[PDB]
């Protein structure tokens with residue numbers, strides 16, 4: 092109602108529901124173990140009993156809305172110069188809404204360094220500690236804005252530059268690429284088993300952009316292999332490297348096995364905390380879950396890692412594909428910023444549903 096638009100609304104609202112559920116007002120951090128989280132989940136009456144009335148969204152939704160609101164304000168056929176001004180401004184400004192929302196170090200530090208308005212004032216230098224998932228968690232709606240094939244170059248550039256406004260490390264900003272790219276694939280009903288291959292094919296194009304852009308190319312290139320290698324390895328493991336083949340999951344892949352797997356994906360032991368593994372876990376959830384919100388939630392919202400970020404990503408992708416089908420109303424009806432999220436979604440659809448261009452840098 093319209094069917095196109097319904098998917099956009101769900102992408103935005105269920106991304107935020109995911110964040111809130113995966114955050115639980117920071118309480119999951121005192122457990123930091125999927126089995127312990129799943130048992131506390133049971134004692135709250137399970138997923139369908141959860142009322143998000145008092146479950147605040149975290150930094151993930153706040154920053155996702157900032158992306159979305161910037162895209163919307165940029166309008167039809169924007170100067171990429173204006174879009175980057177607006178993304179910087181929205182990111183910097185949204186830092187005022189992080190009370191009790193546990194934002195990340197790179198997100199905060201860098202958003203506060205930006206100089207929106209000044210030519211190139213939204214660029215920061217390369218940094219070794221900037222491979223967190225703070226760019227990936229907020230980039231999905233770039234794929235809603237720019238879903239058409241003709242726009243791939245835009246999606247690549249915008250996802251990367253939105254990302255490296257806070258995360259100028261390929262592990263960071265390629266997270267944003269994957270987040271946006273897969274949202275675009277979901278918009279276009281591209282079956283999820285093809286998404287990984289798609290990303291592996293676009294990484295050389297992302298590299299060509301980073302190279303022509305001319306910023307810290309030496310450093311960017313030298314760290315480039317970590318992301319790529321982790322994704323190759325993961326798609327190999329799941330048997331979807333060829334992108335024609337349905338995924339293979341282990342016989343034994345319950346809550347406990349998922350935690351250990353998420354830890355093996357991680358940079359330094361914390362599943363989904365980085366730009367490579369946050370979208371990877373969301374992707375793994377989406378591939379297992381099909382049309383089940385409960386399944387997606389048990390895999391992407393409730394685990395011992397950065398479940399808020401994995402949930403934000405997975406909930407967006409999943410909502411694009413499946414709308415609100417099978418979702419308990421208590422899980423989103425009183426979700427913080429629901430009206431705001433619906434309104435931005437509608438506005439993103441207006442733009443996204445029209446195959447326009449950008450005025451280049």
Ligand SMILES: Nc1ncnc2c1ncn2[C@@H]1O[C@H](COP(=O)(O)OP(=O)(O)OC[C@@H]2C[C@@H](O)CN2)[C@@H](O)[C@H]1O
Pocket residue numbers: 149150151193194195196197198199219220221222223224225226228260262358359364365366397399400
């Ligand atoms: N170069 C790196 N490669 C892989 N991971 C890295 C790299 N540099 C930093 N990280 C990891 O990224 C994790 C999160 O980074 P931060 O800068 O603290 O957080 P940020 O990415 O801004 O936000 C992450 C959000 C914050 C919460 O919503 C949970 N997820 C850190 O604990 C690091 O372990």
Ligand SMILES: [Cl-]
Pocket residue numbers: 132133136137138139
């Ligand atoms: Cl449950």
Ligand SMILES: [Mg+2]
Pocket residue numbers: 114149150151192193194399400
């Ligand atoms: Mg968060």
Ligand SMILES: [Mg+2]
Pocket residue numbers: 187190
């Ligand atoms: Mg205040």
